[PDB]
Each structure stands twice: as C-alpha cells, then as structure tokens.
Amino acid sequence: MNYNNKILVSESGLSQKHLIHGDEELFQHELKTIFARNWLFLTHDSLIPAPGDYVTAKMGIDEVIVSRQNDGSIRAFLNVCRHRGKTLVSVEAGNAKGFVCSYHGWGFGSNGELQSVPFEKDLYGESLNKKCLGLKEVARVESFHGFIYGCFDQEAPPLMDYLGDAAWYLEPMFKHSGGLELVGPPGKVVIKANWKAPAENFVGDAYHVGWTHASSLRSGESIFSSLAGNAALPPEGAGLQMTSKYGSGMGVLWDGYSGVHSADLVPELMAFGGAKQERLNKEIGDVRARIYRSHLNCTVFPNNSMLTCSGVFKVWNPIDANTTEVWTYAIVEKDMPEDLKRRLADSVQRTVGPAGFWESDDNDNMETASQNGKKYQSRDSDLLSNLGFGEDVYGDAVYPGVVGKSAIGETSYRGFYRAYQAHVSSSNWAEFEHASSTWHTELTKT
Amino acid sequence: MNYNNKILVSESGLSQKHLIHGDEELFQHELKTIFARNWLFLTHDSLIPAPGDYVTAKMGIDEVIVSRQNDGSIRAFLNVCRHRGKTLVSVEAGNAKGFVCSYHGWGFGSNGELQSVPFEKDLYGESLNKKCLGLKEVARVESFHGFIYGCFDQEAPPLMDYLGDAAWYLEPMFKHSGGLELVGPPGKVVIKANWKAPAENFVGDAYHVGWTHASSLRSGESIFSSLAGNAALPPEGAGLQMTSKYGSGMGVLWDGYSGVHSADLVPELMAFGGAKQERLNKEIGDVRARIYRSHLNCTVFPNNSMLTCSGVFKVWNPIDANTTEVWTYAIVEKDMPEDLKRRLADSVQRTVGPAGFWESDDNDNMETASQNGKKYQSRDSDLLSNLGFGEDVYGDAVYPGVVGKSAIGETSYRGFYRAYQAHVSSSNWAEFEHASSTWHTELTKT
Amino acid sequence: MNYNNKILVSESGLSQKHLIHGDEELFQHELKTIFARNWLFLTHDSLIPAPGDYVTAKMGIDEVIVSRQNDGSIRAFLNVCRHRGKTLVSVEAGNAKGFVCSYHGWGFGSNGELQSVPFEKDLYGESLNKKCLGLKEVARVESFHGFIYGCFDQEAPPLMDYLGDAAWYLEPMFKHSGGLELVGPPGKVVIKANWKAPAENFVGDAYHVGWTHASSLRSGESIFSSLAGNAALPPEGAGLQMTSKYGSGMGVLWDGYSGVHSADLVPELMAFGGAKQERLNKEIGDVRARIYRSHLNCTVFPNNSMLTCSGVFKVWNPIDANTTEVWTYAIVEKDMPEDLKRRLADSVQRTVGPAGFWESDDNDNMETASQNGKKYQSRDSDLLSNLGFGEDVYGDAVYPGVVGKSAIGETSYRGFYRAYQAHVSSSNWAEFEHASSTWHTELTKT
Amino acid sequence: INIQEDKLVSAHDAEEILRFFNCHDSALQQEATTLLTQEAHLLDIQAYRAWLEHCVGSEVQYQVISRELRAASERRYKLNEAMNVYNENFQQLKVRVEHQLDPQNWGNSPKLRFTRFITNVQAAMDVNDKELLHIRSNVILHRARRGNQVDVFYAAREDKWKRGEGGVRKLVQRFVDYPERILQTHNLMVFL
Amino acid sequence: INIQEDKLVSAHDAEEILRFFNCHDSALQQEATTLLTQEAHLLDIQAYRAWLEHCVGSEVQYQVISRELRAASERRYKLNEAMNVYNENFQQLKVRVEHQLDPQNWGNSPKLRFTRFITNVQAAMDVNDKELLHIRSNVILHRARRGNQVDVFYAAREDKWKRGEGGVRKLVQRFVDYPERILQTHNLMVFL
Amino acid sequence: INIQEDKLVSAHDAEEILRFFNCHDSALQQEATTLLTQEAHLLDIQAYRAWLEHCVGSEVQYQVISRELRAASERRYKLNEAMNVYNENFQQLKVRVEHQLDPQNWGNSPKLRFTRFITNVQAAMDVNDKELLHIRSNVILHRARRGNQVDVFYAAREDKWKRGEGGVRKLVQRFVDYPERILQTHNLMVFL
Ligand code: FES
Ligand code: FES
Ligand code: FES
Ligand SMILES: [Fe+3]
Ligand SMILES: [Fe+3]
Ligand SMILES: [Fe+3]
Fold it and tell me: Was A83 annotated as part of a binding site?
C-alpha cells in the first residue's frame, strides 16, 4: 500500500476505510508514523516521586524504563541491554541506583550510563568505550501537571503545544484543582481489538452510551442513569465536543462530576466538586470552574484516554492490528480525603477495570469492529463519522478548538482521524505540519 | 508470486504444487479469485422456511445474514453494521423483522434497509441518507431444489449453469426423490488443514477408502465393508467418476444407498431406496433411477461437499492456509418416515460429525498434507493426480461431463484443479471463460 | 530487504543488527541460504545400528526419515509421500523394511524407492513410472566418528572440510577416546527464542557463565563452581577460543572433564578422564591428550551444539524467528562402565535437559534477546561482539584456526557471524567461497 | 430456584439443582467419587473393553449435544435446537471401542496419552426408582499425541447409574451439553 | 514454616499453612466440599440471585487483587502494591448480578457457558470465633461464548464462611490474589 | 484386565488398576487426599524447604520420564525407550531446592505464581510391605510469571508413601510418564 497516496480517511475526516482496524502492514507503518513520532503516556510523578524510583512502560511495542534522577528530572531509556540485547528490567516498578543485566552482568546507572562491566580490566583492558554504550534514551520527556509523556522524535512539538486546544479544557482539573495523582498499579488486560477502537470511542463517542451501556446505566444508578436503553436524550446544551490540530479531543458533559460512579459515591462527589467549583469561580471564572466539575471523555492522541471526574486513565498499548493491552489507572484530586481517594480508586476499577462491568459492555463492540477490518468484503468499506458535520465551529469566543456545541456527535472522531491521516501520509513532523496548515478549515466545511 | 504466469496446476490437472495447501499469499489471493467469484453454500429452505427466519453463514472469511423475506424470497447481507462496522448478529439462527446494532442502536430491516437511527431527528436532522446505508448485499442468491447458494460476483453464471454436467447426476436425489431437507444445526469443528484438502478428497477420492478407513469399515459393518484394508477392490463397473467445466465433480458408487451407515440402518435404507427406485424407473428411466439410489461423493466447487445416500452435507469454511472450519449437516429425503430421518441424522453425525469415527480417520491425512505444503523442500514439489488419465471421455451417450468409467481414479481431481487454476490466473469471469474454452479437450488428452 | 547489500553483520563480525533474531522475512531467507545449504545433524550410528533401523529428524523446518540400509550405509529422505504429500512416518524411531502411507497405501522401501501401489495393475496398468517416484532424497549424508550429518546441497564441502579447524579440537574426544555414543531418546522442548541465540551462546560465550549460572554454580557444586556470581575470574591460561572458515567454533576450558556435573560425579569422572589422558599422551601427544579431557563448548554451524566432557549434545531446530525446538541428547565414551554411562546421561538431562536447572538460567536471556529483535526501536540496533578483538591469531604453531588465547571472549561469535553473513548474502557455495577468501584476515584485524 | 426471577436459568438446570440440594448422603458422595475415579482410570489407560464390561450398562444412552446459538429473547424460531455429537446405545459404543482397538487405526500409532480430571461430584438417589443413582460431575480431559498436539476438553456430565450384573453400579445414561459451540480440538473423539 | 529459611515464602502464606496443618476434622472437610460444590453449581447455571440468597452473607467482602511485579529484593519502593479487580460488599455484588440479568446486557446473548472445577479443599474453624469457618480451595473456571471464544481462569481462594439466616453457612469473605498479572481472557468478569 | 483383549493397555497400567480396584478403604482415600492437598499447598507457596522436611522421605526416587514415540506394532527396535526429565534422590532434590531459593536465581524475580489442582486420588496399602502406601493422583499445575507467561502442566502420578520420622507419611517414590512428548511450556522446571 502506498501511504503517500492511499486515502484511508476521507476529506474532513468523514469516513475511514475499515481496513485501518485490521491491516497488519498498516500497523507496522503506524509504529513508525504514529508511535515513533508522537507523545505517549509514561507515568505520573506520584508513581516515581523519589530519586531512584522507576517504572517500566510501553511506548508503542517498545518497552522503556522511566527513572527519577537525583536532580529531580525524569529520563527514559529502552529496556534493552547494549551488549547482546536482553531485556534489562523484568519488574514493573521499584527503586534502584542502577540496573544490572542478568546475562553478562553489565551495570547501567539510573541515568542510563554504562557504569560497569564485569572484569573490564582483564577482559576489555582500556578498549571498551563505555561513554558510547549508555542505554538508548527516549529523546523527549515532558510533564503536564505531573503526567509524564515521552517521544522518540526530537522534532516533535513541545507537549503543551501538542495538546493544542485540548489543554484549555484539561487545565481546570489538571492544574486549578490543586493537581491530580495517579493511583497505581494499573489493571492490565489484553483485548482483541485495534488500539484505535477504544481510542476513538473515548475521544468522541457519547452516542453509544445509552445503548451499549444500557445494563450498566440501569444497574449501577450512576448520575447519567436516565440514558439507559436510549430512554432519554440528554437535554439541549447538555455538553459539547472538541478537537484539535494534533488529534487530541474530548467530549464535555456539563456538571457530571460523579461520572460512572454508582449511587454509593454520588452525594459525596457532587458535594466535593461543587465546593471546589465555588472557590474556583473567583480564580478562573464561572465557565472554567464549571468545566472543572464537568465530565470530560478525552483521548490524548494517539492512545492515552481518560474520563475526568469518573477518574479513569487508560493506555491502549498496541500489540498487533487486532490485539491491544489495556492499562487502567485511577486519577484522584490530591486534596480529596484519603478515604474518598481509596473508594474512588476501587470504583474506577469496579466500573472500567479488568472486571469493570461498564467496560465489559464495550468489548464486543471494539473487538468485532476491529476484526471485521480483516474480512475481505469489509476492508474497502467506509466507517462513518459524519454526525454533526457542517455544524462545527472554530475560534469560538468561549470554547476553543474545533467545537460541536452538542453533547452527542462525531466532531472528535473527525479531528482524530484527520490527524491520523496526516501522520500516516507524512515522513516527518515538517510534512505533518504542511499537511495540517488548513486543519480547522477542513473540519468545519459545509 | 505472479498468478498470471505461475503454473500451480500442470496441464490436464495432472499435478499441483504442494505449496497450494500452505501458502498464505495464495490463500489471500483465493479470497478474491475463488471465494469472491464463485457460488458458495448458504442454507436450505428447511432452515429458514418462514418470513423473518434467518441464519448466519460464512462466505469465504466473510460472515453473512441470510433472511427469508415477506415475499418468500431470500436475501443475504454482510453481517457488518454500516456505521462503525460492528458485527450485527451474534447468533446462528432465529426469527426477526430486523436487526439492531448493539453499539449505537442502528436498526436494519430483514431486507437490509436502514430503517431507524436513534434520535435521528435531534442528531442528524434530515442529513442522513438512509437509502444509501443499507447492509452490503450479496449480489446473487439462487436455489437448487431448496439448497441456497450465494455469490458476491454479479457476473457469475446462473447456479444451474455453474453446476454444469454435475447437475444431471444430482437431480434424481435432489429433484425426483420428492426433495431433500437439511437437518440442522450443523456440527462445527476446526481442523488444521487447507480447505482444498477435504474438498479434493470428497470430489474424487475413492482410492483412499479401503486403507484410510480400514478400521471404520471393519468396525461399523456398513455396506462398503468388504473394502477394509484393501482386502477387496470393487468389482468391474462398480462406479464412475465425473467432472465439469466449473470444477464440480463426483464419484458414483452404484447401488450404495446405505452408504457409511452401520448395519443397524442398512436393511431399512436398502428397502426404502429400492422402493423409490422402482417408482422412479417409470418417471426418469432405469439409469437415472439407479443413480438416485447410488452413493455420490461430490464437491460443488469450491468448498461444499456431500455424500448422497449417506446423507452428509459439508462446508469447508476457510480460515487460513492451514485452518478450516468444518460444518456438518445431515440431508434426508422429505418423504422418509420421521423416525428414520431422526436416526439417519444421528448416524451422519456418528460417522462424519464432530465425533465422527470415519471422519477421524481422515484428519491426519488432510492436516499433514496441508502442513507439509509450508515446508521448504516440499513447496515446489508436485502432488500427483494422474490416476486414470488418458481413459476419460466427454460427450458420452449415457453419462455426461468428463467421465472416467471406473469407480476409482483421479478424474475429478483433475477437473477440480483445472477450474481452480483457471480462476487463480484470471481477473474476472470473462477471463475464466477464455481460459476454459477447451476444458474438456484438456482433461481427455492422451 | 536486499540480502546482497544489507549489512546485517559488520566487518570482522564485530556487531550484528538486532533484527536478525526477530525478522521473519530473514528467517524465511535462512531456510534457503543457511538450512538448505549447510550440514545439519541427523543422528548417531548408536541410534540406528542395525539394518532397517530408522529415526526421524528435522533439517531446518523439513522432516526427514534417516534409515540404515542393508549394505550398512545410511540414506535420508523427506518424510513426505510422493502421491498427495501426507507425512509418511508418525513415530520418532523404529525398525522396518519400508514405510506404507496411511492415506492411499503406497509402500516405500527403506531405500526410498516406491515399491508398491495398491491395485497397481487394475488401476494404473503399466502407466505408473515407479522408478521416478521414490522419496525425495537428502543429497549428502556423511559421518564424523559415528555422528551423522545431512545436507540438501550437493555442492557442499565434505563434512570433514566443513568442520575446518574445529575438527582438530574434536578428534581427541570423538576419535582417540575410542569413540562416543549418543544416548537417546532426546529431551524435546520449545523455547521462544531464535535458533541463533542458543547457537551463539554455546559457540562462544564463557563470559555469561558466572553471572547467568550463579545459582546453578553455587547449588550444584560442579568443578567450575568458583565462578558463581563473578566471585572469581578464571586464572591466566585457563582456556582459549577458536573459530573456523565455515562458522564452527568452540571454547576450551583446560582440564574441566567433569563439566557441569554435580559433585556426586566429579571424583569418578576426573579419575576416568585422567586415566585415559595418561594413555593418550603416548598416542597423540600431551597437548591433544589434554584437549581430550578439557571441556569444549562448541557449535557445529549452524545449529548443532555440544559440551564435551559434560556430555551434552543439542540441536536448535528452527520453527520461526522467535520459536525453536530444542533437542537434548547425552554423549558418553563407549568404553565407560555402563553404570557410569547411565548416571552421566541422567546428569546431562538433570542439568541441561527439559528440567535442566542450568539451562533454565539461560531461558530469559535467549527469549528476551530474541523477542527484542522484533521491537521497533531495537531492529536497527547493534548487538556487540567485540570482546578480544585485535588479539586473535591465525596459523598458531600449536592451536589451529582463528584463536583467542584466553578463556573468555567473543572470538567464536565473530567467526560464527562472519560465516552467517557470507551465506545470507550469497546464492550458492561458490559465492560463499568468494565471500570467504580472506576470512581469517578479516577476523584478525587490528 | 425461581426461574422467573433468576432470568438466566433454564428449567432443566433448576430441576437438577433441586435434586442435589435436597439429598445429603455423604456416603453416597464417596461411592460416586470412587465409581467415577475408577471409570476415568480405565478410560485414561485406554482399557475400553474393561470400561464397557465394568462401567457401562446394557441399556445405556451416551449422549453429547451441541446446541445452536440462539438469541436469549428468541421465542418464534422452533427448529431443532441441538445436534448429537454422541447419542449411543451399547452396541454403538462397542463399534467405537472396536474402532479404537483395530490395529489398522493408523491414528492410534504412536499411542495417544489421556489424562482425566474429575471434580465437583454430586450424588442423589432417584425419588421414584430407588435403585437409580443420579451423579453429576465435571471433567477436564487432556489428550496428547504426535509430539506437539494437545487438546483439552471441559464439560459437566449428568449421569444415571444403576446396579447391574453382580450388583456392580453401571452407567445407564450420560448427558453432556458441550459448552463450546465450535470445537478447537480437531474432533470430539474422546469419551467424556 | 520458618520464612527466614524458606526464603520464597510470604508471612501471609506461612500463617495460612499453620491454620490447616493444625486442624484435622474430616467431617469439616466434607461439609466444606459440599458447600463449595453447591456454590459452583449455582454459579455455573447462572443462578446469580440464588447464589446471593443461599451462598453470600450480608457482611461479605468479595476481593480479587492484582499485585504489581516488584523485585524479590525490593525494600525501598513502598507505594500501593496491588489494585482491586473486585472489592465488593453485598450491595455491589447485587449491582453486578442485576447487570448480568438485565435483558439489555447484549453480551449475554447468546447465553454464555460456564464450567467450574473446584479442588484442593481445606477447612479449619477459627480459633477465636468458633462460628467462623476458614475454607481454602482452588478453582479452574472455563467460560465459552460466541462459537469460538474460550477463556480459562485459575486461582486459589481464601474464604471465611459463617452460619447465617436459617443456620445456612454463607460466604463472609473471599480473597483471591490473581496469579496472572496481565489478563489474556478479555476481562475478569467472572465470579471466582 | 486382559491385555490380550484390551489391546491398547500396557502390562504396567493393568497391574496398577488391579491394585486399586481391589482395595477399598474409604478412610485411606481421605488420608491420601489430605496428604496430597497439603503437599500441593506447600509447593504452591514455594515452601520448598518445608516440602522436603515434611513431605519427602530420605530414600525418595522422584522420577519423571519422557517416552519416545514408537509404532504401536513395533517389536524389533529395542534401544532406550525413555529419558529422565527428573530422576532424583533426596540430595538431588535438595540441590534443586537450593537453586530455587538462591538470591541470584534471576528468573525468580519477580516472584513466580503456582496453582496446583490435585484430583482422582486413589490409595491402597501394599500387600507385602504393610507400611507402604500406594497413592495415585492427577495434577494440573499452572505457572504464571512476568506479566504474560502462562504454562499449564498435566500429569498422572504414581506415588509410594511410607511413615517416617515422627510417624509422618512421606514420599518414597513418585513416577510420572509425562504425556506430552515435545514440551510447549518453555521447560519442565516444576515439581509435579
Ligand atoms: S546482554 Fe546484557 S550484559 Fe550481555
Ligand atoms: S456500529 Fe452499529 S450502530 Fe454504530
Ligand atoms: S498421499 Fe501417500 S499414498 Fe496417497
Ligand atoms: Fe463505552
Ligand atoms: Fe475419507
Ligand atoms: Fe548458559
């Protein structure tokens, strides 16, 4: 397939070829043009707070070690020994000054440097140039209010610029709330879906909720429970959708601070969120204080998703075109009482974790949609994302980005796929930029 | 591999490259040139008799919904939602006026039309062109005496013409007997063989029976039991072999109406078949009435096989070059007593079903022959099908098609593979026809 | 990938691209340029001593039948019927005059000839040219002191020439000891590593032993036990490393006759080896008699490895780029007492067999190093094998081959990979020879 | 069980619960465990004739079904719900045993290896036929052959056993509703 | 057990050994086996309401954890060692049961098939609370759906059971430390 | 069993049937079940020293074989039919235990997870040695490590146990004929 020319996503992001969820050659191409190019979620300050603390993380199909340095910075390195290529670290988290390889005993610092080699003097003499044998380092590591992302491509935009218009929506919860903590360890489960299926669903899919999650809505008694079985459409002005130049997007459901949480947590959460909002009105204005306590379903392009207020944080780790390893953390506000934090974390896993009854509702949707992309008569078929097209705006006086002023639509699909197509057909960041110079015009046609 | 030029099957069908049972690139090519082009078995009238009755079926690797319409016709559609591509129907059979997608709730009629979309007015307004969003329909659906076949290619010959000279042999049992019923549900088992291995075995392989099935012949006491261990060759004139332009073929074993059925059913069957034959002599002539009660081992090209009289009906559903999903039904004569029909159906599954002791004898044959097609030193080796070559006739005054007038030979292999090669090397039906304009001359050389 | 031009192994064998352990297209290319070209281990005289005795063996991914002929020679044939390609023999060893196919009953002799066909007269008449339908024969089969190797390529060097300078080291144990016996049956286990990972480790890796095998060294009380945890480097002159033109190589650890064997066997072995050495001094000279009772870790290129004195014999049978089927035999000296032979065989399996506690230490090393070769950021990375480079010699007055006069280094890696690269980039033996005309000069640079 | 409230429960399944929750006779549970362990041992060593002689009643029905996947809410479509993978009388079991033992059963060389794991044994005497014993048990059956073929089967068995010749309890009915619709074990050519 | 000598053994695991190696009460082992076999039978037929009513105590904690992979020699890193796949009270179990039984639970059509294998039952009365029964058992749980999906789960269960309404023993705590860190079964949406 | 009639049955297998079909001593079956469940519990928590001390006799032979695939009709080829995956005396078992517990056993970090399922227990006293207990049982052994590695082992065990120090019954022989010829579990580095 010639990725320079093949129209995988149509103009304005209105449709995508079904093969994108099934084609293994495209998956291999995405490793280069999506995962090796873009910012990928690694960890949170809260999981590696002290010098020498480390975690392992995936970046695409690669595994990295992410380590808190003595100077307080974070550096990340391929989890691969520079000698004969053994995996260096076999655990998920810990604290160490360095990492010794279990094959021949080479010792690397927490800073990636090759510090020792057994019997170096007797064996290598002075001939081993250890200065050139440090672990392969992730070129870019940056933080968004404690959330640490990495990028293999030195040419990437700064993380803040990469978030584009999405950042404005995230800041009330990520910054002005006093900050968030990631509660580990994550749940980890493999699903037989393409990584794009959950990514697209979280970025932009409010339409499915009433039908897909009918049983979870009815059974759990959450705040959004009137939606069960499409019994009731959200009212006028219940929310909006947004997207951005580099593909990140989200839905906003006004006031839904208790999110997916079952009635057991609703009163406590609605009190806590409302109290903080009252304080934030004075600091950031009524609209943004309201956004703070509004439910955001967001994907940070390509494969990191979250539900603010529900407190869900997801990584869709790619394995192959129909296999994805799903990592599920809880996010909590630092200033919540510890007992509430504990109960919130358990409720996140209860709802969307490995035995998450809500997330179970989505399994067949994402698995069969992905697997159908391999089937001969479906490969060249068009997946549709035209809901709300012709009603999106850009440059709004109150809400930035390309915005659909309705709770339910496919605005965020279109922006996600526009960015995806621009990357897949480009060889580097400069080419992506050239391909994206009229991004918002494209999205707001008709 | 250049399929226009590569000789995968030699002239006259005398040999085939072993790689055809192992090569995954060829398997992908067959999805286009075999499965997307040819007629494939779907279901029987007896399984979807009433309006709204439906089954799911495979066509190659694609899944279809096959539905009885209100006007009595049958239409078939890809089992894939037109929105985001989820599998629509997750069951094997039922009755419904339509199908609702569990992802976003789109509702399709039994006629494939997009009938409803949740909140269409509020969400899409008048902008959704539902008339263009019906399920992707199988272009051709036709019946052969209640047996329903489909074809994705509008350019295919009519099913009757496609059966060619094979139809003449099938009609006594399929038509003049008063008709057949398919008894479901089928057994379903995955085998680690290429779909062509069982297809070729059923189309034309009487030679294996005495040796492969020695233990089943000896143990079951069936009518063909003298063959066990190659203890006895069938006598002179015990049967014949035939093949046809579009690849379908069969063996005929004169008078073997009880087939694989164990001695418990032999007397009852031989009485029933003989009685009907006596009536059919007057209607269709002695030869054809005899064919009615003669055992036919047939493959309807590419991947549907049957044993008449034994009452076995098989679909060899392709998964990959060394994986096939085997569907096993029983076929019974409509006018048999119900108790006999029941016992016949159980006996079919007993012998050739998921725990079929006869079919178990064939497993290693087909699996290892297929898997050896992947092995380096065997890929370019020649599978032989020369038995009886130079003794076949065409245009016989009594028996139509290319015919070998002997019970045991490889006539039907040659015709199967001649058609296969003509398809694999052609881009459409017109090219297949051009490649087949001297089909019978090729088969009857020397 | 263009294998004529792609530098997979750098000059002097100093590094290799990590992708060589992961790339499936390269694995397929190796089937042609490595496995179909080179000598591969089949069996030992001791396993097929009598006329009609046979074993099955793998040669690359192909399976062969290896059979003792009536005249005392050994011939080997593809385990694939010449009719429809079924696997002929389903057992690992036996005694027979021939092999009958279970599909249609064709009968082949122990000499590969097609001897009978059921009902030949009635079915084929005189038309079957049985003389042309013998099993596909392995072109070359030769013995090295009872160890039988095969080669599909008629153009290969004789086995003795192929062993090159390695033969000199093996002869004291293989020839002058009175000869070895292979004790079957082998252990068989699948590991998720590329075949080259264990091959390279056995050919040349003494460096890993103290660290990788720390727990086995400490727990087992073997003769090399002072190495545990890199507590002690072997002294000066403790051994050497060698390699050869056609890729075979080994390490030599002076005097280590009891090898990996736990203290229970050490005194008995050290007595037995020492006694034989005293006799061999007179016959082959002190140096070679010492080599006899010195531990050799050798790979006979490409995929047969051994530890003399420990008595380990391995075949690394390739399945795919990250899958290998490991066969483990014991080798014993024919003139050892039978009770010692029995205990030695059990000790081999105890240490390096399917539950071998030593070999278990190596699993993660080889599996992760191989699997990392598939990971995007590692494919183009360089595996290093520069230890000892610039200190190797060729043409030494005492020790032949390219020799590093130190127990620990990467000399044998370099020779292995030099030969590998010369094969991968060549279309036949003549091209390999042209690519290897300065093999030792290349290895001894700087 | 109230199957109007417990919406996922079949009438058949509810009837079988009631049978065992009522009975408790600990000695019967032990007798049943012995019976089934001995049966499994005979099968595992491929003593199929011994199994017929010692474990299988002359009036046996040995039945394994595969049920078509239908909508949970389905109420109109009424055609055959299941097919019989096995539905054997004693003579038909004997045919299968002879097929296993025939020296031209090529697929039995080299010899297969079976290991059976029987768990969750429950036993209750029939209310009406005081000599009929109901036994329920689950089986994992592992079959290994030809170096690298391994198939694992999982099932629940509803049995009836009755005292026969010599007072030996023998199997008079076995019913299995096989849980996997599409078999991924090559065939179901094993005695569950 | 001396965990200074038996270096791989956790303090928690050593405590549980001591509990059962001390007790032997063969009748208790039998009562426990019955309890667990009946529980498993109810679950296997998807009688989730019956399971709640007959097997689960009002004060239950139903907990399944997944422990982060840490170095055996780790001693400094002190953050949350595990997450809760399940950590349910009775009301939260009831929500899960209602979700299973809801006729708009699309993933339950066609009906799932469950088979559970309970083994290695051990039982001991609590030393201090004479009405609290400790039961340990292992489970293999086979789930089959939609033709060709098969998931097999493996776990050890540490239970506490107490006599409740009507004198019926009911589950008051279940603890499972799930042995596989990354699930390869799509989800863990099964009651272990 | 008549192995001339039951053609697939080995003489060895027929001898073992006879041993258990003769005995019935229900209390012995229960003692054996306890013994094996406790052994499995010790192994599952990796209390390998405790296992040696409490479960393994000083005179033990611990043997697991792998038999070469030969023709069912083979009668001429007479070379070694099997190799020993394990064939351990007490000292050799101790070496293996020390290797497991060594803090430089890198493959044991992060800690492995074992779950064992013991079924089909049969027990009979030896006819001649009144203090020797024959126990047969089957095991499923699940090993999980490093996030996504899972290996499942299946075997039948023929054991001899004898009362030793303190009157505690200990294992004096274990024999396993491993059913899979080519292992697909990376290694067989587990105590069956
Ligand atoms: S591979 Fe890491 S030290 Fe050699
Ligand atoms: S995928 Fe079917 S309604 Fe959306
Ligand atoms: S395939 Fe061997 S005789 Fe036909
Ligand atoms: Fe959802
Ligand atoms: Fe057949
Ligand atoms: Fe090693």
Answer: yes
